[PDB]
From Swiss-Prot, chain A:
Interacts with TIMELESS (via N-terminus), which impairs TIMELESS self-association. Associates with the MCM2-7 complex. Interacts with RPA2, PRDX2. It is found in: Cytoplasm; Nucleus. This is TIMELESS-interacting protein. Belongs to the CSM3 family. Coiled coil: none annotated. Plays an important role in the control of DNA replication and the maintenance of replication fork stability. Important for cell survival after DNA damage or replication stress. May be specifically required for the ATR-CHEK1 pathway in the replication checkpoint induced by hydroxyurea or ultraviolet light. Forms a complex with TIMELESS and this complex regulates DNA replication processes under both normal and stress conditions, stabilizes replication forks and influences both CHEK1 phosphorylation and the intra-S phase checkpoint in response to genotoxic stress. The chain holds residues 62 to 147 of 301 of the full protein.
Curated annotation (Swiss-Prot), chain B:
The chain holds residues 146 to 288 of 863 of the full protein. Sumoylated; SUMO2 modified in response to stress caused by inhibition of proteasome activity (in vitro). The modification N6-acetyllysine is found at K62. Disulfide bonds: none annotated. Coiled coil: none annotated. Belongs to the MCM family. Acts as a component of the MCM2-7 complex (MCM complex) which is the replicative helicase essential for 'once per cell cycle' DNA replication initiation and elongation in eukaryotic cells. Core component of CDC45-MCM-GINS (CMG) helicase, the molecular machine that unwinds template DNA during replication, and around which the replisome is built. The gene is MCM4. It is linked to Immunodeficiency 54: An autosomal recessive disorder characterized by severe intra- and extrauterine growth retardation, microcephaly, decreased numbers of natural killer cells, and recurrent viral infections, most often affecting the respiratory tract and leading to respiratory failure. Affected individuals also have adrenal insufficiency requiring corticosteroid replacement therapy and may have an increased susceptibility to cancer. Early fractionation of eukaryotic MCM proteins yielded a variety of dimeric, trimeric and tetrameric complexes with unclear biological significance. Specifically a MCM467 subcomplex is shown to have in vitro helicase activity which is inhibited by the MCM2 subunit. The MCM2-7 hexamer is the proposed physiological active complex. This is DNA replication licensing factor MCM4.
From Swiss-Prot, chain C:
This is DNA replication licensing factor MCM7. GO terms for molecular function: ATP binding; ATP hydrolysis activity; DNA helicase activity; single-stranded DNA binding. A motif (Arginine finger) lies at residues 476-479. Belongs to the MCM family. Component of the MCM2-7 complex. The complex forms a toroidal hexameric ring with the proposed subunit order MCM2-MCM6-MCM4-MCM7-MCM3-MCM5. Component of the CMG helicase complex, a hexameric ring of related MCM2-7 subunits stabilized by CDC45 and the tetrameric GINS complex. Interacts with the ATR-ATRIP complex and with RAD17. Interacts with TIPIN. Interacts with MCMBP. Interacts with ANKRD17. Component of the replisome complex composed of at least DONSON, MCM2, MCM7, PCNA and TICRR. The modification Phosphoserine is found at S463. Early fractionation of eukaryotic MCM proteins yielded a variety of dimeric, trimeric and tetrameric complexes with unclear biological significance. Specifically a MCM467 subcomplex is shown to have in vitro helicase activity which is inhibited by the MCM2 subunit. The MCM2-7 hexamer is the proposed physiological active complex. Residues 484-527 are annotated as: Interaction with RAD17. Its EC number is 3.6.4.12. O-glycosylated (O-GlcNAcylated), in a cell cycle-dependent manner. Ubiquitinated by ECS(LRR1) E3 ubiquitin-protein ligase complex when forks converge following formation of DNA interstrand cross-links. During mitosis, ubiquitinated by TRAIP when forks converge following formation of DNA interstrand cross-links. Short ubiquitin chains on MCM7 promote recruitment of DNA glycosylase NEIL3. If the interstrand cross-link cannot be cleaved by NEIL3, the ubiquitin chains continue to grow on MCM7, promoting the unloading of the CMG helicase complex by the VCP/p97 ATPase. It comes from Homo sapiens. The gene is MCM7.
Amino acid sequence: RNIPKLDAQRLISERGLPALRHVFDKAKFKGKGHEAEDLKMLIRHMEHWAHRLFPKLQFEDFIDRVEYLGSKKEVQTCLKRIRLDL
Amino acid sequence: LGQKLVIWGTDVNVAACKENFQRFLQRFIDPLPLYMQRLGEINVIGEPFLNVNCEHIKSFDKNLYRQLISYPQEVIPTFDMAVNEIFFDRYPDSILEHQIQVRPFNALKTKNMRNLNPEDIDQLITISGM
Amino acid sequence: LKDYALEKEKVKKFLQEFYQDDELGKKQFKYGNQLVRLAHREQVALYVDLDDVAEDDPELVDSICENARRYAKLFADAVQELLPQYKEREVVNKDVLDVYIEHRLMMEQRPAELMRRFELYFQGPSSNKPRVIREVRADSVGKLVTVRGIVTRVSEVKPKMVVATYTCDQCGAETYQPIQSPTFMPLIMCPSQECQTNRSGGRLYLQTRGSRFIKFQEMKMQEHSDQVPVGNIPRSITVLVEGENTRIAQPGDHVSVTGIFLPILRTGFRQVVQGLLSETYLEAHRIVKMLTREELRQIAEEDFYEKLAASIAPEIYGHEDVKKALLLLLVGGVDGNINICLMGDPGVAKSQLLSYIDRLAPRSQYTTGRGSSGVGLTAAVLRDSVSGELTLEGGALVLADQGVCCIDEFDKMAEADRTAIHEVMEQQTISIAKAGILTTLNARCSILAAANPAYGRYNPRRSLEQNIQLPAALLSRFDLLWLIQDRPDRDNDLRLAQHITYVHQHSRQPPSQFEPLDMKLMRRYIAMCREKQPMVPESLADYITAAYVEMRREAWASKDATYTSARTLLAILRLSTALARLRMVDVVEKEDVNEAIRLMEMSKDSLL
DNA sequence: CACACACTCTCCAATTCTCTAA
DNA sequence: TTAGAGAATTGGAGAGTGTGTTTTTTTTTTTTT
Ligand SMILES: [Zn+2]
């Protein structure tokens, strides 16, 4: 059966942050004075990444869960690794 | 993003269809700028629909007519978006109870009731009857 | 019983290697040449003939006939596996399902029944003699049978789902559901692994654009009445028709259907209640329905008008006047009907004209006005209460729509039917309520009426309405009112009796020493002569006026101003234009007007 | 009869509470 | 001050139980024939 979870080890560092590193390589922001549409583009890309990661939840529920997951060993180790090299 | 859309299993681009219908509205003139007169009539009368002749669509652009006949469920909402975009690009502060409906029609019947087939499903047809 | 894996290869060998000679002894592979067309989508229906299969394996023919549906599926699988061998061109996509399949194939490069756009049918072997419906017994269940019958009810062509195509909203994948049963369960939630493992909750939307439909048509066949046993009701069978077999047959058509006799599948509570019993249908596989130079040189004879009139009723003497009038009934006036009424005693050769004209007319009916227990002059509703659907039947006036309707005992017509005759003669249609909702039927037909006096023999002492007891509102619609008299007359009676006795003892018409035109030649002639649409010249208006007024004034001066009106002139013009059509000249002339006037005058002379 | 709906109960495991070490 | 290992509580998957279903004719009577 394998009921999935948005936890620290199934997908957040497997289809999650490693892909999120690449999501915005081809983004198209235009800077000062256009913060509204830049934020709309950002929110759409983040929402799409979150949906493909864990499709069971809505976007704000996903955010409220992943913010809790930010305290876990695997998540912060991957965060520091992504900060450093790869 | 609208430019990424294609009708399902169809290879027709929704944005290109919208642009083709917009230039049709802008440039067709000869039933003897035709449809901007109809837009002005809508603007003053207050009826949210536009009647359009499929023969005019065909003579202006055969491919657009083929797309309309084959895939009306997507193409006709695309035409609704096109006509509303033109109408509210003009007449900027006119108020309508609803968005305009494009109502394509053939002047005469394309088919009859006895010859309707499963090949015609989800296809735009014109028939005469009582 | 047999190994169907080996049987499929046998079928492939037959389809690949069979050959027949069509022209100049040249050899052709009749099924390979059709597999090429099937591969190119030039042809959709493949009728494989078990008479051809019998030429190299009668055992395969016996297996097919005894287990037909299994072998139909095997032949379809074999043909689908063979078409790639015969591919040599690209298809022009013309169905939207072709376009969808094209993009499906491209995305797969980047559902066998779905990719299968053809249909295969067994054309029955001649060793299987055709049965009647009553002989299609339970032993023939699941077996290929040929059945003859009358088509009596045909549904509209409906879309029958074969392969339902769905799309998922979450994962963007297509799902396919082949449908064998008459009913099926729609798919709700996506069964794809991507949705299932993630518990995505993505659901399925049917795409009719991507799904495969087939034309479907139900009909009812009925036994031939002369083939029913003596005391019995005619039996009936449902035939389910699909694909290219649809629209072949219509109601009233005599048909022979080769098909598979199967029991009906049931769902819900019907299988609970019915138990071992089952209703049956025939799965249709093949439906079969049961001058210019040479005769123009004959038509050049000046006899041709009287030759046709003589050919309109060779069994009757002296009535060539009436036969000419009935010729103009069949020809009709310029646009246009011509209506005729015949009055006479019961038991006279006045029904003979109705019978002959009905037989000769291409579209026709011959009913009686005496209140039929069936479908009357007008339409009627049938309930079909195995299912309950109301359906509409035409009747005499509707079934004779673009032709001629013969009505015997026209006087005994009830008022409910007389009003319908008024509707037909005024506006050429009838109207009926099917379920409280009213539908309108065409009846653009010429009426040949035959009445009898209300009581006793005809009596010229009385007026015509007194004789027939039918109002002038009916009688004035007609163009010619004829009295078909009958008096004892020794030599004519002797000849009639000799004629009828010859007919009895030899079952054939006696030699009359005249050669009438054959019925098919007469039909081709009338079509050729009614194809014309003449016009009356304006210079003849004065002569038409003169003829009309002098006929009118003779009625004033000599017969107490008996009824005439402007429709008399209109009837004269219609008769003269019918004569012009008959003569195949596109201009009406003095002779046409004279003969129309003469015809009307002699009909009134027969009355008087 | 029997094949779909409608409803309840139980178990399983996933999340949160409590106490401890980094 | 953060967070992680062990114990207890709550969410919901799914196993099990019970319910519901597939125009026609003869005769009378009042009013109108
Ligand atoms: Zn899916």
